[PDB]
Structure formats: C-alpha cells, structure tokens
C-alpha cells in the first residue's frame, strides 16, 4: 500500500509489524472490517524498537495523535480520553503499558472498542511474551544463517505458546477476541543496527558541515564497532548515545584544540580503537592525536 | 557403546541423552575426566519422558541404585539429615539420582558440592540431579526445532549459552555448581514417531498376555495407533498412552470377553471406523466381522 | 623462612599472605609472642584464592587439621552446640579454621575470644594455630588492589603490598564495625591479606592445569601434550571471580580436555603421538606428522 512504502521509508526494521499494520488498516478500507467500528492492534515486543514510532509515523500519514499510560491506570482510583477524543474524533491513539492495567478500565476499553469515532485507530502496547519473542526471533535467526551456509513469524508458536501467554495475561476472552491484529515487534537484526548507526552519524555529519563546514566521513568498520554497543535494555536510543560518546567527543574535542579548522574532510576508520583522520593539502590523510 | 546400545534398546526415544550420558561416561574410562571423581549429570526436561529410568538403565548395565527427592529437602533441620550417607554405606559406586533438585537448600547443595569435589569412598558413582529448570523454554525451542524438521533432533549451542545459562544461573545463583557440572543432559518432547513406538509397546504386552492365558491372538492396524497417540496428556507421559491403552483397548477387549464373544485359538483384529475402534472377529468364513459388545 | 618457601612452592600467589602467616609463626617461635597462647590470623579476602589451601599446607608443614564452618553456628542453641572442644580434644596443637566468622553470635565469639585468651578448654590448645576467614571489606580490598595493580603498570608504562594507612583509616572501621568489640580485633595476632589473583598467577594456574593433563594423557595413552602461551592467555580469558582457582580448572577441562577427549574417541590419537595446542579466536589440535610438519586435527560430532 502507499502507506506501508511510506513507514517503509522512515521506519527503520520492523517488516513484519508495518505489513501487518497497513495490510490491516487497507483491509478495513476496503470495508472487510466493521465501517463503524475502529481498529485494534496490540502491539508485542520489546522496548523501543519502533513501536511508538510506528504509531506516530502512521498518525501522521493519515492526517492527530494520543498517547497514554496504563500503569498510572492500575486501580479504580486512576481508573475513576474523552477529552482528547472530543478534540480529535478520527485518531490514533496509543495506549502504552497495558499488562498493568486494572480489569475495568478493560471493560471500559472494550465496549468503547465495540460501540466507538469509528475512524480511529486504536493501538495497545504490551510487554508481554518478550522473552518467548526473543528467544523465538535468536532461533529464527541461527536457523536463517544456517540456511545461508548452506523472518516471518511462526502460526503455529503464535497459537500453541503466545496465545497461552495472552489468555493468562488478561483473563478475558472476549479481549482477546476483540483485537484486530496482533502486530510483533522483532529484535533488530545486524543490518538494521548498522542502518541506525549510519544514521546518527549522517545528523552529526550534517550539522557539523552545516555550522563548521566540516565535511565527515567513515567506513563500515566505525559502523559496526559502534554497533557494538548496543543495549537491549532500552533500545535504539542505545545506539545514539554510544555515537555521541565515542565520535561526537572526540570531535569536539579536537575541535577545541584547534585541529578542525573550517573546510576539512576529515574520515573516520578503525581493543579496536576509533582512529579520526584528516585531510591534508598533500591529497593524503592522516591520524589526529587528541591528546 | 554396548551401554548406548542397551540404553538405546531399553528406553524409548531420548536418543540425545543416551548419547550425551554414555559419552561422558566412556569419556571418563577413557581418562579425560578427573578419575578420582563421581560424575554430575544435569536432567532438564519436562516429566514422565525417561528421565528416571534412563538413570535406571544406566545401573542396571553397571550393577546398586538410589533415589531421592529434594523437594522433602526444603528445611534447613532436613540439611542436617541430607539417610545419604547410610546410602553410600550398602554401595559406594552406585548411581544416585536426585528428584527436585531445583528445590533445595543452599546449605543441602553445599554440601553436594563438597561430595562431588571430594567423593567424601565414592570415586565411582554416578551423580544425576533432575530438574524442572527453563522447561518451557525447553519445550518450546524443541517446538520450532520440530518446525523446522516438518519444513525439512540437536539443542543449539547459542541456545545453552544464551537462553540456558542465563535460567540455571538464576535458579541457583552459585556459580561453582553449574562449573561443578559434568554434563547437561536435555530431555526431548516425544515426537509422534516415539508416541507410535509407545502405544505399539503397550498393545504388545496385551497381546502376549492375550495369547499367554485365553490363546488369543491379538493384532492391529496403524490407524489404531494414531487413534490411540491422540489420548497422550502432556502433564504426566508415557503411563499417559499406557492409561488410554486400558481405557480403549483392553476394557473392550475384558468386556468382549465376559460376554462369551472371545473363543480359545481365535483371532481378533482393532481397525478404525469421532473415529470409534472397532474389534473385527476372524470367523471360520475366513472372513472377519465387527463384533458387538452390550454397554 | 623455610616454612614461608614451602608454601610458596606449594601455593600459587599470594606471596604477601604467605610472608604474614611465615613471619608469625617465627615471630613467636623466637619467643616475641606470648608462648602460653595461640595464634590468631585473619584472612581477609576474596573466596577460593588460596586462604584454606594456605591453611590446610601450614597444617601439613606442621604435622592435624580442623575446619569449622560459623554460619551453622549463629544464634545461642547453636552457641551451645559450639563439637569443637572434641575435635580439639582429639589434637590439641592444630591449626583450625573457622569460616565466615563473620556470621557469627556475638557470644560464640566471646566464647572464642575467651578460648584465645585463655588458650585452654582440661584441653590444653597452646602451641595451636586459630585462623578465622571472613568476607569482610572485600569489596575495599579488592578496589584498592585494582587501583595498586594500575598505578603498578602506570610505573611500569613509565618506565603489591598493602599500605598500612589504607589499613587503618579505612578497613579497620569495617572491622569494628562488623565485630563491634575491641577487645576481639585487639586480640587478633595478625590480620593476613589475600589479594586477587594477578594475570601472571592465573597464567600459573592454566599452565598447572594443563600439566595435569599433559602427566595423565602420556601417563595411560602415551600422549606427549604441549602448548604455546596464546593458548594460557585464551583460558585465563574465561577466569570467573565469583569462585577463583577451580573456575580455571573448569574451563580447562571445558575448552581443551573435552576435545582430547573427542579426538581420543575417534582414533586420531594414536599411542606415542605429540599433540600440540595453539591458537588460531579458536583452539587448533596440532598432531606431529612423520613429515616434519604439525598439521591441525579436524573433529567431527
């Protein structure tokens, strides 16, 4: 669809979840779903590997998006929208946390699901069978290199080991049945976190001409060293910061010294250490000392 | 082997752990592991699938056995107790198979760990502690795994490594015990195949006892098998067929029998007509026919 | 002293523990200790880095040994219990260890102090030697070993003993403050350090290992076993710190004794054979050809 070429082209990964995603919201179009009634994905995986991304890069398309916490929501208290629906009929809206939701905030969900703002999109983000997601994905993954030396998701893990997860999760099987799609998150393959590295420093190779004049290069060794510092615990973000602590320093660094005057190239190149060369006027390039 | 032989003709399925057990075990006569030290296997896996009486077989080709549950062992006055040493007393170089042993104490596998490092003489025994560890993780790798055989049998390394060790390490949180191992040993999911093999097993002891005190000569068809292999339960195991065998098959071959419907020297077939198991009769018509058995 | 070598020709580093535990002993047995009473060591430290190997080699210089574990013993039905006073009945002059002292009562430790300072139970335990292990400051311990070992090497690029004041001003508030009594840390004849295992001693540890190996593989199947030194550094990369020395024993028997052993089972090793460990990171089995050239064993599960 135009849509799925659109988040194609500014999602990084996630195949899986964005066909999933639009398949779906094009089959609603072609009225295949209730025209009433708005559509509900709940979205499986880790963290910030798209997810809220997706959400926003889909809300943008279609127009405008809202966003919630369910843990603030966890006993009747909290549980004691509809003004942000009232500015906005037609949204998407994303309800973050769900697993740790109090049960009758999940009633009210679902007959708002049911009795719908029909033009919205109604998107639920759990943490829940992340670990079977992942050791799922690293199998996939082994079996994917072994086919090479010599990723779709499984239905049947979907039915026989996740669909045990979910039941317990929420104890209602009339959630379950309610959702329209559950869309899964996979864990960023190697050539994805290269795609992030790349990237960050693009940003940083852009700015840096935009303001200094300071034309930045690399080779795909400074890629994957970087990408060898990429955390689990919280995502692609992981990735960004590595960049701007291990490239973006030493370039100010060596800016304040003095050793980047305006109009360089200067090209970075690779314990593996990060070498930063410069351009001379002798057509060759060689290593900057720091110090 | 001639044990990995006599394991691979007295278990069923479980060809991984046959290999892994008897190959640590000739890996030691072979004098590459320490010689004046008990083995240690690890059993993970899920229940009834052959665990114990791998441990059995293995004793019963060297001799002489012992059994005990951990799980008895939640107390510290009971880590006092850890009837063990009047165990090793009677036989010495005997295998020793503890159940649960994921529910013990930290001072009961302290003092485990000081039997396997010292042999406190027991140099020659062999240690197999089974555990209902990362199970489901298991289960479910062994699941794709099958997936993958279907789209087409080996735990993967990375699998271990990167999934296994992080479990164990978690459920005993010492890191000199899981050292300490000799050898992980995994137990498989049956596959269908193994169910067949079960089920064939069980009609095989009907049958024999059949022709053993009635003369009856008791014979079936493979659909009975799949018929049969769909009333395995998870939860328990292989006495999961046995059960459905009985509650089948030899209820209505006792019930056909009462009834004066099964004749000395004759001949009764199982076939498949919810698919209901019919008893087909040989007459003297050399034909044969279903028989009728009143409720 | 020739006690203090002959636990350096049995124990691998820890010189620093040694020369504390030797220097004691003849410290008292000059005659510049109080004769009528026992010695008190404690060994401060990090697990499985030598502390009840230095104690069990003392005990067999010496004779006969004794080894007591205080966890068991940490509340007063327990200090009843403190058993002792039979093993010691048994042997009066031997050197005893109590372990985790830590975790103790405070009036089994009066009970211990008492049997420090009166060095009787009658059951005379003079001439005995009382060394209490603890997990106490470990973690200060270790951290300033860390910083001692960099400021080395910063020295050595340029070109361990412990210092007393990091003794005083920083671990003896951990003591007293983990035994609350002073009476108990005053009568402690000597505090003995035992520090992490340095890259040089885990080198040791790797090569005595695999001399084990090497004696038992030509012992029984006349296999001649070597090895270059990136193959000791490759095992000593694998050191877990949680439990010490045998986690080296572990990985040896884990990385290069399993595949001896799978190359014995396949017939690639022949009696009389040299088989040569390298490194290639992956560890590469050379056999000896009779064509003077070392070629790598493939094996195949």
Redesign the interface.
């Known amino acids: 669809s135009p849509l799925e070429r659109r988040l194609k082209e500014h999602i990084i990964g996630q195949e899986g979840a964005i066909n999933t995603v639009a398949s779906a919201i094009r089959r609603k179009e072609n009225g295949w779903y209730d025209e009433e009634h708005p559509l509900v994905f709940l979205f499986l995986g880790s963290s910030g590997i798209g997810k809220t991304e997706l959400a926003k890069q889909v809300a943008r398309y279609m127009h405008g998006f809202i966003r919630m916490d369910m843990s603030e929501f966890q006993e009747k208290h909290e549980v004691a929208l509809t003004k942000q629906l009232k500015q906005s009929p037609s949204a998407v809206v994303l309800f973050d946390e769900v697993e740790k939701a109090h049960p009758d905030v999940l009633t009210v969900m679902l007959q708002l699901f049911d009795e719908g703002c029909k033009d919205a999109i109604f998107i639920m983000t759990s943490n829940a069978a992340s670990d079977?997601i992942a050791?799922?994905a690293?199998?996939?993954r082994?079996?994917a290199q072994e086919q090479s030396r010599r990723i779709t998701i499984?239905n049947?893990?979907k039915e026989?080991?996740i669909r045990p997860i979910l039941k317990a999760h929420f104890r209602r099987d009339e959630f379950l049945g309610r959702i329209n799609e559950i869309v899964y998150f996979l864990p960023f393959c190697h050539s994805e976190l290269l795609q992030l590295v790349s990237r960050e420093l693009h940003y940083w190779a852009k700015k840096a001409k935009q303001r200094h004049n300071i034309t930045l290069l690399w080779e795909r060794p400074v890629l994957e060293l970087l990408v060898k510092g990429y955390n689990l615990h919280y995502g692609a973000r992981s990735i960004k910061h590595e960049v701007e602590r291990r490239v973006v320093n030493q370039l100010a660094a060596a800016f304040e010294q003095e050793l980047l005057p305006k109009g360089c190239t200067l090209r970075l190149t690779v314990a593996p250490v990060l070498r930063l060369e410069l351009l001379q006027e002798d057509k060759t390039s060689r290593k900057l000392e720091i110090q």
């Open positions: 079977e050791q799922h690293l199998q996939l082994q079996e499984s049947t893990f026989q080991v």
